[PDB]
């Protein structure tokens, strides 16, 4: 499992949490206590805050305004859940603006998300700082989401869980969110989520790694699923 990790020159940590114990794997374990920008993984918290504070619904269609976005794949209409899986920044920036800086700040503090700092710009703080979060905090946040244990209404947590539903493999279910922060140095790669196993156990996970411009986009998920197979959490079908 260690051999898997250093087949790349990836500098990387993989964290698991089962509600009592944190386990760490990879090439650079100190990464798990290290704080990084959440990038696209912040969409989980943005969705939760938005639904809880009645700023959006899980059925609302955020329409494209016709102005070309950073990626052409984002030049369409999205619900929050579709935007979650496509990582559609401008949709979640619209949501963040509906929320507003003081409510966003008060809410991230209330729920104890990372360092709880947003600064002045309500649509940039998760992409360039000053908000940072450790992979351990990330694994515990999504674990709590999985259990309905976050400080949000139960139906809100359920809605955001379904936004993260990415694979069914028998009676096992995978929930995940990827992230690639490119506007910081060094670049940060995330793949965070949980597996709801057929036996009833949930295991939460977080991949956190250094990235750079060459890197293939699928590598984070591949790695994660690789490790989860090796650990026995989510076997390849
Ligand atoms: C979030 O961290 C950023 C997005 N995160 C990801 C990602 O996790 O893969 C991407 S990749 C981007 C969106 N999908 C485009 C694509 O796959 N095609 C056009 C085929 C590439 C983003 C970098 C967000 C902050 O931008």
Swiss-Prot record:
The modification N6-carboxylysine is found at residue 43. Changing residue 70 to A: Reduces catalytic efficiency about 30-fold with respect to oxacillin, and about 5-fold with respect to penicillins and imipenem. It is found in: Cell membrane. A beta-lactam binds at residues 40, 43, 87, 178, 180, 220. It is a lipid-anchor. Keywords: Antibiotic resistance, Cell membrane, Hydrolase, Lipoprotein, Membrane, Palmitate, Plasmid, Signal. GO terms for biological process: antibiotic catabolic process; cell wall organization; response to antibiotic. The active site is at residue 40. It catalyses: a beta-lactam + H2O = a substituted beta-amino acid. Activated approximately 3-fold by the presence of 0.1M NaHCO3. GO terms for molecular function: beta-lactamase activity; penicillin binding. GO terms for cellular component: plasma membrane. Induction: Expressed from an upstream promoter, P(Aba2), in an insertion sequence, ISAba2. Expression level is positively correlated with gene copy-number in clinical isolates. Class D beta-lactamase which confers resistance to the beta-lactam antibiotics, including penicillins and oxacillin, and moderate resistance to carbapenems such as imipenem; in the DH10B strain of E.coli. Acts via hydrolysis of the beta-lactam ring. Has benzylpenicillin-, oxacillin-, cephalothin- and imipenem-hydrolyzing activities. Belongs to the class-D beta-lactamase family. This is Beta-lactamase OXA-58. It comes from Acinetobacter baumannii. The chain holds residues 44 to 280 of 280 of the full protein.
């Amino acid at each position: 499992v260690q051999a898997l990790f250093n087949e790349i020159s990836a500098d990387a940590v993989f964290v698991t949490y089962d509600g009592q114990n944190i386990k760490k794997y990879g090439t650079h374990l100190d990464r798990a206590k290290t704080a990084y920008i959440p990038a696209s993984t912040f969409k989980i918290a943005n969705a939760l805050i938005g639904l809880e504070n009645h700023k959006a619904t899980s059925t609302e269609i955020f329409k494209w305004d016709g102005k070309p976005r950073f990626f052409k794949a984002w030049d369409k209409d999205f619900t929050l859940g579709e935007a979650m899986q496509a990582s559609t920044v401008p949709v979640y920036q619209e949501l963040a603006r509906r929320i507003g800086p003081s409510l966003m700040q008060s809410e991230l503090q209330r729920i104890g998300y990372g360092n709880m700092q947003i600064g002045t710009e309500v649509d940039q703080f998760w992409l360039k700082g000053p908000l940072t979060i450790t992979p351990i905090q990330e694994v515990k946040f999504v674990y709590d989401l999985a259990q309905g244990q976050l400080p949000f209404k139960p139906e809100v947590q359920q809605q955001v869980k379904e936004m993260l539903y990415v694979e069914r493999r028998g009676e096992n279910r995978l929930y995940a969110k990827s992230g690639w922060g490119m506007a910081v140095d060094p670049q940060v790669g995330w793949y965070v989520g949980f597996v709801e196993k057929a036996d009833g156990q949930v295991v939460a996970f977080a991949l956190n790694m250094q990235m750079k411009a060459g890197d293939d986009i699928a590598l984070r998920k591949q790695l994660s699923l690789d490790v989860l197979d090796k650990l026995g959490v989510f076997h390849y079908l």
